[PDB]
């Protein structure tokens, strides 16, 4: 018997995205809400998300990426001449873009079963992860210096992030003085350690400009 996604379940999803926006806590929700849903049902939820067109652009292309990938590892038989039982699900089919609700349900209840509903879901999750990333605050603790990156370039980036940080003036001090040195590559770090704990920024740059 077919039971489509309940309007209540679909409505809760709206309020979730409405409140939680795109914090990392949304994903767990999405999973709980989308448990056992068909590729069609998932799409309903996705299309139910108003606004946030930016994040959506990502989700979309991400879907397309995974779908295209699927076709490579599963080229089954393009053009099933002479009928048999049931055609194999292509990427676009899993995504539900080119598959009827019946076909989807069919693939899920066949021997062996092809859980297209779950497969598509996984792809959506990956897309959601990417979205959360671009929405997550820039942590200065991850700004390291590349082994070939000019010291000046590193400084520009380091300070840029600093300008966009929520921390007390005291903590910022530690970052400017100590941290900047800590994340420098082995060579520059070796030169900075020669100047001592109190060298000025200008001095450091002049020392590592080679």
């Amino acid at each position: 018997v077919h039971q489509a996604i309940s309007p209540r379940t679909l409505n809760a999803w709206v309020k979730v995205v409405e409140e939680k926006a795109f914090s990392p806590e949304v994903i767990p929700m999405f999973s709980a809400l989308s448990e056992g849903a068909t590729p069609q049902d998932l799409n309903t939820m996705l299309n139910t998300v108003g606004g946030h067109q930016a994040a959506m652009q990502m989700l979309k292309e991400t879907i397309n990426e995974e779908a295209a990938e699927w076709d490579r590892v599963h080229p089954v038989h393009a053009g099933p001449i002479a009928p048999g039982q049931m055609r194999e699900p292509r990427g676009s089919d899993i995504a539900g873009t080119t598959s009827t609700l019946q076909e989807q349900i069919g693939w899920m209840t066949n021997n062996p079963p092809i859980p297209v509903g779950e497969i598509y879901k996984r792809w959506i999750i990956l897309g959601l992860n990417k979205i959360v990333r671009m929405y997550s605050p820039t942590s200065i603790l991850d700004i390291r210096q590349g082994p070939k990156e000019p010291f000046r370039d590193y400084v520009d980036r380091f300070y840029k992030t600093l300008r966009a940080e929520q921390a007390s003036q005291e903590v910022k001090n530690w970052m400017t003085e100590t941290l900047l040195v800590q994340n420098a590559n082995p060579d520059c770090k070796t030169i900075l350690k020669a100047l001592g704990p109190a060298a000025t920024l200008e001095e450091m740059m002049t020392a590592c400009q080679g």
Partner: antibody
Amino acid sequence: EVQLQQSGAELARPGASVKMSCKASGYTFTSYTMHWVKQRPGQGLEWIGYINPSSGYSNYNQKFKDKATLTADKSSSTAYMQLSSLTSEDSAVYYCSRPVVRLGYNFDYWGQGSTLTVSS
Amino acid sequence: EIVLTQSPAITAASLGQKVTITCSASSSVSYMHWYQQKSGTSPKPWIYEISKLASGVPARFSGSGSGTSYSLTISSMEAEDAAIYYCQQWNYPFTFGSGTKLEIKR
């Protein structure tokens, strides 16, 4: 013309304190660090420590901890070195030097010196 | 930690003689600096990064060495070269050497 004009000679009671000065000129005070050196006859040249004009951070030589205290005044481009709990052992000439950064620190600029005499 | 011991402690050279003073560090150091000081005056930067001469320093001067042993040499000693020479750790904590008093042999 980068110049460092140090304060005059000092005379203070044993156990007291004193604060020397060094007025910098001809360069951006906050862009460089300021170091201090002690000179006693028979043990010439000992590094005391240095101050970062802008951040106000001071790093001292373990030996002179709880003895020396560096400060800087951006507005008057002057660095102050304060000595406390004086003994005849501290009577000496105190210099200040601003380095030039090349492959590392190069102490190219030194002050004329200030002779401190610990006596009552 | 690092201690710079210079030797000889005091020596007198005759005008024209080739002089060579050394500096021994307790542990390896990348570079070494050299300063010249005369009675009643601020020490003057003489040699940077082991062998680079400072401004106004006579060509007769030269430096060399690596790791734990460094040296300063005067090809032809001259009157104006009499003074005290100190060596210095190129990096923090910028420790100074014990010094060497160079005099004139008459």
